[model samples]
Every structure is written in structure tokens, then in C-alpha cells.
Target: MEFQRVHQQLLQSHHLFEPLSPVQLQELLASSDLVNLDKGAYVFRQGEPAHAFYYLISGCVKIYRLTPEGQEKILEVTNERNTFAEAMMFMDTPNYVATAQAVVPSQLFRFSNKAYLRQLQDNTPLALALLAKLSTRLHQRIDEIETLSLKNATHRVVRYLLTLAAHAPGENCRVEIPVAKQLVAGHLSIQPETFSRIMHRLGDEGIIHLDGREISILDRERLECFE
Candidate 1:
């Protein structure tokens, strides 16, 4: 079951695995060490030489950067079925651009920089697919910037809840925020107190029900179409 879970995690990242041939896929499966990180463990830190890329099998991770004054900021959070740091592997200096840490006890496959590229070298199509993944991520970052610039706080919070709900199974639009509220606030460019206020306001409006960590959207129209 664990093997299947890990395999499925790789499978779900369409941008990463969709281009691989069956043989190439098998080759990847055969290689690598299983890297385990406890909650709050640093996968790697900024300014470190990048030697390997990783794929998350279970749990979530947050990528963060420290400002010159040493304030921390959360950039992105990965919740399983994802590959990270592939492009950095090919850079000349190849230093990590940010820090990555597990937000929960997580298992990941660590592919040595050399070995993973060797497979890409032999498999041309696979390399292009990797490029596509990078392009997709770039666009996602752009969208995030746009969200921060153009959207309201309500839009950001509701959209995040909707994204979580889309991945869940239920008749009610239920969302279990995967990361801490402070992390989500950074991701959305809002204050943590502001996040709390927005949630409470929405709850008072009867648009959603919030009980500690669980958030259930009561009205889809108000939740999604909130101005």
C-alpha cells in the first residue's frame, strides 16, 4: 500500500509524469532514496548547493524565503503529488533559491541531480515535458502576483477555500486548511488577524460555518461570488 501511495503521488503530477514512456517511468520507480521529514523539518535551506530534486508522497511542505532583515515569508505550499527543484538541478551554481520544510510528517523520493538528468538526457520528450512543467509554474507565480495585486481579501480567502474544496470529496463544500493560518496569510498577502476577521465575518453572514479548523461553505453563490 505504501508503494502504491508513493507511485500514485508521482502519477498525479501530470506535468511531470505525463510525458514519460512506460519504460522511463519504471526506471524512475526503480531508483532513489526515500527521504522522510518530520513536521517542521527543513528539506533544504537557502544558499545551499542543490544536489537533488524531490517528489512528495504524503503530507505538505512550504517554500519560504528570508528577507534581508531576516523576516520569513511563505512562497508556496505543496500538498503531495508534486515534484520540486528540478530546474535548479541544471543551474551552474545551482544554489537553492528558497527554503523548503515539511509542514507535516512527510515522505518523499529524493533523486540525485546527476541520475535524474541522465534519464532526461536519454529521453528527449521527457525533458521537454519538464520544461513545460517549469513554464506552468512560472505562469502560476504570475497568477499569484495578480491575485495579490488585483483581488480583495475576501476573494483570496474564498478562492483558497474553493481550491481546497475542489480536491475534497463531499456534498458540502468542506475545507481543511492544509497549512497554518499564518502561512495562508503570507500566501495570500494578508495579515493573519485579517484572515481571522474575514472568516468570522463570513460566518456571521451565514455564508460559511467555521469551527476551529474545519470550514464548511454554506452558500456556494455567496462563497464563490463574494464581492
Candidate 2:
């Protein structure tokens, strides 16, 4: 990323850094390193020291964990402008519980945990703003947990499709699958094969028409009332 773009992103979107003066922002950026990881590259691995946190600038990251048998379970697929491992900044010292891998070519900025926390503690208004932001994320997590615990897999998929088509003009709407289909299976709590089977069957049965990853939403109302 160019210096001007970085400066604008810090001042405009990054809440904590928004409180910093241009010089302080420069200092913070100067202290960090920019990371560029190609698709399938590891950003951090399971059980590694959480010495710092990252802010994604572009592309997608898959946050996942391995089962005892080495099966991959995706926690989430995050896109641009997401901050992760911030909680690590507050811990005395901690290890990463999950692994993060780039789903596509990615760019990120890393800030040392100690330096970030020290800076975070120095500005009163900034600290409060950060607290509110974290709280908001916490509540969102709660909602996600509730959905996963209560809803079944098919319901989640249907809801996702409906959400993608929600604002479009008509019965005809196209939605791109946000990540790899198998990874999406993990996110929705179903086996990847089950996911593909359902989509393929639905398309053949005219329940959901498929065109590559961009599925055709022929009938949103019918999908909402999916059996």
C-alpha cells in the first residue's frame, strides 16, 4: 500500500489510530512491518507466540483450527480492513489458539503487542473508543454463537443466500460464493461434501439454479419457506 493510502486508512477507518496526530501515526507505522502473503501462505500458526496483532489491508484470511485428527475447522473468512489478535495486545503474553492463512494474495500491517497496548493506554478517549469497538464485536460474536447453536445447517445456507439477494431488484439475482465452497462448508457447520451435494441437487431439482459459484436466486420467497 502507498503511504498516502495508509495514512488515510489510519486516520479515517482505524478508530484507535484516528486519535493520533499525523506524526504519531507516522511513528506507529514506522515501527511496524507490512506483510504480503500469497494464497495458502500462513500468516500465523497454531500455538505460536502472539507477540503482535495484524490489520488486513486487502484479500481474505481464513482463521481456522485443527482437530486432534488434523481436520481443519474454519472459524471465519475475513476480508479487508479487519483487525485480529487485538485481544492478544491486552494479554500478559499469549499464544495463538488458531492458525490464520491467506485465502488469496494478501497485505497486512503488524503492530507489536507491547507497543500497541502502551499506545492504546496513553490516550484516554482512544481507549474508550477502542473499548466500545471491542464490545460491539463481542456482542456480534454472541449473536453468531447463538445462530450456530440453534440453527441447522440448511437454514444457515438458505439465510446466507437470502441475505445476498435481499437488496437486488427482482426474482433474478446472482450471488458469488465469498470463499471456497469447502471452506464455506466449515463456516456453516456442515461437511464440505454435504454442502456441494445440496447445492448440486438443489440446482438439478430447480430449487436453486446454479451458474458456477454465482447461484441464481429464482425464488427468494420460496427459499425463505424452504422445507
Candidate 3:
């Protein structure tokens, strides 16, 4: 699908064009392209030139790195309205350190790194906005790393569900797991079978109820006791 058709939605999302004049927005749009990816399709591979940053419009993408033993370790998952590949934007090497793969059919907007930097250079407010976004992402990654290092498998799983619930809006109290269970297990540095066992244990303990990719927390307070 062409981004022009959804230009207004993109503008409202992330406020990308809020500070820009209509002409500036037009200039920005000139360098943007829309892409649709199928499940398991790769957006880019590790070591590829990171020429563009991508913003998710729908579905989910997994960002992962391969272990020396050839196992995949998921680093993060990007969903609707989130952006990925920012780490490569300012690096001198300018290559992706990890790969992005679609976990489901997805749509994304691709913006050239050159054009993005140019916009930031010309617009001080845009530069600050980008910095703020980067800062928040950095902190999030740090927290994830810390949790993996310091927390037990059960604690990590509980925290993961809580994080998902926090991100979700409304009172539904349910969270969808974006990536495959094996991928999430790898991200937490746990064996896939062990992860499955932990999930079942949590369900049996009445902390949460798992239904395939959907998880519902039955007791948030009990879940928090691990922390």
C-alpha cells in the first residue's frame, strides 16, 4: 500500500509531522515508502547496510541476533506504531547488528537515514523529539538486559507479562505475545521447554491463564511479589 493513502494517520502517529510545515511534510513524504511483509519474511538481515529506519504500521516484528551456536536470541519485538533500527542511524559502521523478521503479516513505513538526519538538522524541534525517543528506547533495552541477568525464569516471565499489560490500554487485562514462544524463551536465555513449563506452572499457580498467544493475569498483586 502507498503511504500517501495513510499519510494523515502517520502524521498523527508519533507526531512525526507535527512541527513541520505542510511543505516540509511534503518533502519528508517524498523520501518515505510503504512496505508490506508476510509472516517470517525478513525486513533486513544482520550486517546489512542500515540505510533506512522502519516504523511499524501494523502487526509485529522480531529483532534478534544469532548465537555462536546458531541459535536465535530475540532482542526485542516491535508492534504497531513503534519504530526500529534507530541504533544504526548514528553509528559510523551503519550496518544492522541484528535482523528484523515479521512475526505476522505487517505494514511499515521506511524512511531514509539521510533524509531523517537532514530533517533533524533543519528542524531543532525534530532533533529533540528524536533524541527523546532514542533515550526512552535505550532505557527500555537496559531494563530488559538487567531483568534477564538478575531475575529468575519465573520472575522474568511474570515481569514480561506485566510489562505487556502495562503497555496495553483499557481494562481488557489481556496481553498478546507478539513473537513465538521459542523466540521469547531465547530472549530470556531460557530453554524453550523450560519456558513452557514455567508458563504452565504460572497458570497452575493461578497467577495467569495462558491461551496460546493470549495471556490473562488473574492476580497482578501475586505476580508482583516476585519483584
Candidate 4:
């Protein structure tokens, strides 16, 4: 009954789980495991054999790659109710390409890729659902590539803030910067001081109000058109 309870919870969290019938859900869950991690804990390291991907139940995890200079370049920060590393299942290398680590205390459902692949062999609808999801992720990643390559630093910062306000309930939205400012900056591939400077400029221009980690968007239109 505990498994059923969690199954229902997963269905409620994201539409990705909605496609799995009860039997399929049970099959998947049978091979899945729950994991918890503290801040600074690693879920997986680069070059490790990739056997599973994860669904976040709570907290934040950063997917990053290490540069030759020993610096970390954050590729993504997955939040609650999202699934991550699912793309790894399709990689030819059969090893993790980047490291996944917790930026805050976190809990997740680690799903066995082999089990899912087994289901995919006979489940056309399920396979289609997954492919659609992955395709959308690819589109988003392409947009990110363009922004990183073609946009200026200020444009990226403004875009990032607007993205956070995307699901807000009202015009003037307040959003918490999920991780540390430094980490958020890292996610944008910008320096911490640069991020601060942009926030200061936004505040000076009355486009936003910043207090510690909380940012209140005062001018959505202005931020969107910012270059």
C-alpha cells in the first residue's frame, strides 16, 4: 500500500508518470529505489557506469561538468518533481558524462534504466511519451546554447530572472534564487560579482527589488526586452 501511495503521489507531481498504467508503474517501482542526500553530496560522478536515472521528490541537484582548470560548469539545476539524467540512458558511452550532486538536502527516486528499457521494448505509447519529453528537452537545450553563445551577460541574467517568473501567479512576482547566488551565477556561466552587479542595476532602475536571496520582479516587460 505504501508503494501505491507513492505511485499516486508521482502521478500527481508530473505528467511524465501519468502515461504509466498501474501495472507498468508497479513494474517500474519494483526496480526503483529511493535515495536521500545532504547538501554537497553526489548522486553520481562523471565516468561512472550509468545504470539509472532519477526523479526528484524534493530539493535541488546540480548536473555539472568539470573543466581542465578544475572548475565546475553547471549544466543544470533540477528542482522538485522533475526527472533528470534520463538522457544518460540514451548515451552510447554507457557512462555518466557529468556529475550530479545535491546543492541542498534532497530526496529522489532512482529508476533502473534497464527496467525501463525492458518496458520500452513492448510499450509503444510509453516509448512515444518518453521521446516527446526528450525532444522538448532537446529544444530547450538548444535555446540555452543559443543564449550562451549569442547573448550578452546582461541578457542572460534578465532571461534567467524571467524564466523564474514564468509560472508565477501574478504580474509582480517574487521568486527565491534556488541555490546560493554563486551557484546560480555558475549556472549562468557568469561570475558571482557580475550577477550581483546586474541585480544592483535592475534594482537601481526600479525593474526589480532584491533582498538577500529573494527577488521581486517589478517590471516584467522591461526585463523581457532587456538586451
Pick the lDDT winner: 4
Q: Residue 94 lDDT in model 1?
A: 69
Once model 4 is optimally superposed onto the true structure by TM-score, how far is the C-alpha of residue 75 displaced, in angstroms?
A: 1.3
Error of 2 at 183 (Å): 32
Model 1, total clashes: 0
Candidate 4: tens digits of C-alpha lDDT, residues 72-167: 998778888888888667564589888889989999888898987778777587778767775776798899985674447787887776676787
Q: Which tens-of-lDDT digit does each residue in 20-111 have in candidate 1? A: 76776667666667788897899999889888888887899888787688788887777777777766866744688888888889998887
Candidate achieving the largest TM-score: 4
Q: Ranking under TM-score, best-scoring first? A: 4, 2, 3, 1
Q: Model 4 — TM-score against the truth? A: 0.57
**What residue runs in model 2 are displaced by over 4 Å at the alpha carbon?**
1-6, 122-125, 132-227
Model 2 RMSD to the real structure?
12.4
Work out the TM-score per prediction: 0.53, 0.55, 0.54, 0.57
In model 2, how large is the Cα lDDT of residue 103? Answer: 77
Model 4 clash pairs? Answer: none
Residues 1-227 of candidate 2: C-alpha lDDT, one tens digit per residue: 45555345643556556556667677677778878899789989988988888888879888878878868998777778778766666766578888889978999888787776777676677778767775776798899976664446666777777776767656756676677777888887666666776677678767787655667777655666653
The weakest ten consecutive residues by lDDT in model 4 span 6-15
